[PDB]
């Protein structure tokens, strides 16, 4: 208990979360490099997009200058949710923003696609979840990549970010990313801050990375 209640979220926020985890498209590219910055806690990827009608460039925000230095210049893979609202730094009017979602490319490939085990409870009762639901090709994966996939299943299966009206029964929820080599990382499914992207997605800014090898996800849902 002590997770945020769905009712504590204001108007637009709920809709924007559903926009984020169900409707919007995600960025996903392999082998990209750049030493281009805007602000010292950022890395600017010019020409990131090449078939997207609106956007051209991509500005990734990080926690600090230190973290930037780690990927700056290196060959990286990108996987995350981006937005255009209140976003600038690159090609004027054609830049998209994104928090984290960057891992080092070289030596992070897995011979085979890893399917991440999901244990799910609804008011205590266990519910079986298909294994192809969440998967990755990285030894080291950002929590964001796994998180985006898991919440999409939660939307489809449980109408998670829908209004009570449109069959949204879950009122409180918690997602846990468990690993043995380290302490777990868990998110209050209803704890995002703010109403729009730029603020809601700020949770992936730490660019948290966990090892996919022998790891699973725990989800707890409550209709009250
Ligand atoms: Zn567990």
UniProtKB/Swiss-Prot annotation:
The keyword Cell membrane does not apply. Disulfide bonds join 87-97. It holds the Pfam family Stap_Strp_toxin. The keyword Ribosomal protein does not apply. Its cofactor is Zn(2+). Keywords: Disulfide bond, Enterotoxin, Metal-binding, Secreted, Signal, Superantigen, Toxin, Zinc. Changing residue 218 to A: Loss of interaction with the beta chain of HLA-DR1 through the zinc-dependent site. It comes from the Bacteria. Binds 1 zinc ion per subunit. The zinc ion is necessary for the toxin interaction with MHC class II. It is found in: Secreted. One of its GO terms (molecular function) is metal ion binding. InterPro entries: Enterotoxin, Staph/Strept_toxin_CS, Staph_tox_OB, SuperAg_toxin_C, Superantigen_bac, Toxin_b-grasp_Staph/Strep, Toxin_bac. One of its GO terms (cellular component) is extracellular region. Zn(2+) binds at residues 178, 216, 218. This toxin seems to be coded by a bacteriophage. Belongs to the staphylococcal/streptococcal toxin family. Staphylococcal enterotoxin that activates the host immune system by binding as unprocessed molecules to major histocompatibility (MHC) complex class II and T-cell receptor (TCR) molecules. In turn, waves of cellular activation, cytokine production, and migration into the lung tissue and airways occur via alphabeta T-cells. Also causes the intoxication staphylococcal food poisoning syndrome. The illness is characterized by high fever, hypotension, diarrhea, shock, and in some cases death. Monomer. Interacts with MHC class II molecules alpha/HLA-DRB1 and beta/HLA-DRA chains. The interaction with MHC-II molecules occurs at both zinc-dependent and zinc-independent sites. Interacts with T-cell receptor beta variable 7-9/TRBV7-9. This is Enterotoxin type A. It comes from Staphylococcus aureus.
């Amino acid at each position: 208990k002590d997770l945020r209640k769905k009712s504590e979220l204001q108007g637009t926020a709920l809709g924007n979360l559903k926009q984020i985890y169900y409707y919007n498209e995600k960025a996903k590219t392999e082998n990209k490099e750049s030493h281009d910055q805007f602000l010292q806690h950022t890395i600017l990827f010019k020409g990131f997009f090449t078939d997207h009608s609106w956007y051209n460039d991509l500005l990734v925000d990080f926690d600090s200058k230190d973290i930037v230095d780690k990927y700056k210049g290196k060959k990286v893979d990108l996987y995350g949710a981006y937005y255009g609202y209140q976003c600038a730094g690159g090609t004027p009017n054609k830049t998209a923003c994104m928090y984290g979602g960057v891992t080092l490319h070289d030596n992070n490939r897995l011979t085979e696609e890893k399917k991440v085990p999901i244990n799910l409870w609804l008011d205590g009762k266990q519910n079986t979840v298909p294994l192809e639901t969440v998967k990755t090709n990285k030894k080291n994966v950002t929590v964001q990549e796994l998180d985006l996939q898991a919440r999409r299943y939660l939307q489809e299966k449980y109408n998670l970010y829908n209004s009570d009206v449109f069959d949204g029964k879950v009122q409180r929820g918690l997602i846990v990313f468990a690993t043995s080599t380290e302490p777990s990382v868990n998110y209050d499914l209803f704890g995002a801050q703010g109403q729009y992207s730029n603020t809601l997605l700020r949770i992936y800014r730490d660019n948290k990375t966990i090892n996919s090898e022998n790891m699973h996800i725990d989800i707890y849902l409550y209709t009250s």
